Design an enzyme around this catalytic site. Structure first.
Site, PDB file in Angstrom:
ATOM      1  N   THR A 185       8.371  24.531   4.892  1.00  0.00           N
ATOM      2  CA  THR A 185       7.323  25.038   5.165  1.00  0.00           C
ATOM      3  C   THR A 185       6.420  25.559   3.937  1.00  0.00           C
ATOM      4  O   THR A 185       6.710  25.712   2.281  1.00  0.00           O
ATOM      5  CB  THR A 185       7.970  26.516   5.168  1.00  0.00           C
TER       6      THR A 185
ATOM      7  N   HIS B 120      16.486  28.517  -2.182  1.00  0.00           N
ATOM      8  CA  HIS B 120      16.099  27.826  -2.126  1.00  0.00           C
ATOM      9  C   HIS B 120      15.151  28.320  -0.769  1.00  0.00           C
ATOM     10  O   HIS B 120      15.289  29.447  -0.866  1.00  0.00           O
ATOM     11  CB  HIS B 120      17.135  27.529  -0.857  1.00  0.00           C
TER      12      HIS B 120
ATOM     13  N   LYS C  95       8.988  14.011   4.912  1.00  0.00           N
ATOM     14  CA  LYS C  95      10.601  14.381   5.549  1.00  0.00           C
ATOM     15  C   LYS C  95       9.829  15.162   7.063  1.00  0.00           C
ATOM     16  O   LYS C  95       9.445  15.577   6.959  1.00  0.00           O
ATOM     17  CB  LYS C  95      11.356  15.556   3.921  1.00  0.00           C
ATOM     18  N   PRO C  96      11.422  15.758   7.019  1.00  0.00           N
ATOM     19  CA  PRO C  96      10.534  15.955   8.669  1.00  0.00           C
ATOM     20  C   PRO C  96      10.348  17.554   9.324  1.00  0.00           C
ATOM     21  O   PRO C  96       9.439  18.216   9.709  1.00  0.00           O
ATOM     22  CB  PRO C  96      12.338  15.935   9.348  1.00  0.00           C
TER      23      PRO C  96
ATOM     24  N   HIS D 186       7.399  24.066  -2.254  1.00  0.00           N
ATOM     25  CA  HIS D 186       6.923  25.188  -1.277  1.00  0.00           C
ATOM     26  C   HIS D 186       6.081  26.418  -1.747  1.00  0.00           C
ATOM     27  O   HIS D 186       5.787  27.113  -0.893  1.00  0.00           O
ATOM     28  CB  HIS D 186       8.593  26.339  -1.188  1.00  0.00           C
TER      29      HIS D 186
END
Ligand SMILES: *[C@@H]1O[C@H](CO)[C@@H](O[C@@H]2O[C@H](CO)[C@@H](O)[C@H](O)[C@H]2NC(C)=O)[C@H](O)[C@H]1NC(C)=O
Length: 110
Positions: free
Chosen positions: A42, A103, A38-39, A11
């Site tokens: 950010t 996360h 990956k779909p 990230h």
């Protein structure tokens, strides 16, 4: 810290909004711990320190909203691993493991 290292890799970017290219990075094994193409993901255009600060008062695994806004690039809607790209400035919501971001939950306040 392993979780922190993975978070930074996935990230945080030192690239500028203009030089950033979703088609390149979303498919760059150097920045795709959970796999390439990956779909959605950010990216935070900032040094790592300010992002880690988001967890300076967190205890245990808990979600925290940043008090400052960051420049964010979101890569999404891939078609054969080619993406739509959008950039916004906003707060972010992350999960902290004590003092470490682990996360990315969502853009904006939690
Ligand atoms: C990443 O790939 C996408 C998809 O090819 C690029 O967006 C397309 O760009 C072409 C022009 O090169 C347009 O004609 C299409 O309409 C665009 N499609 C979409 C979904 O926007 C995108 O520009 C590429 N990223 C970069 C930084 O070049």
């Amino acid at each position: 810290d392993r979780e922190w290292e993975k978070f930074k890799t996935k990230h945080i970017t030192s690239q500028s909004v203009a030089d950033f290219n979703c088609n390149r990075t979303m498919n760059d094994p150097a920045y795709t711990p959970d796999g390439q193409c990956k779909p959605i993901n950010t990216f935070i255009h900032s040094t790592t320190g300010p992002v880690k600060e988001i967890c300076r008062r967190a205890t245990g695994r808990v979600n925290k909203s940043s008090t400052q806004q960051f420049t964010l690039t979101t890569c999404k809607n891939p078609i054969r691993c080619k993406y739509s790209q959008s950039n916004t400035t906003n707060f972010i919501c992350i999960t902290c493991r004590d003092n470490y971001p682990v996360h990315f939950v969502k853009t904006g306040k939690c």
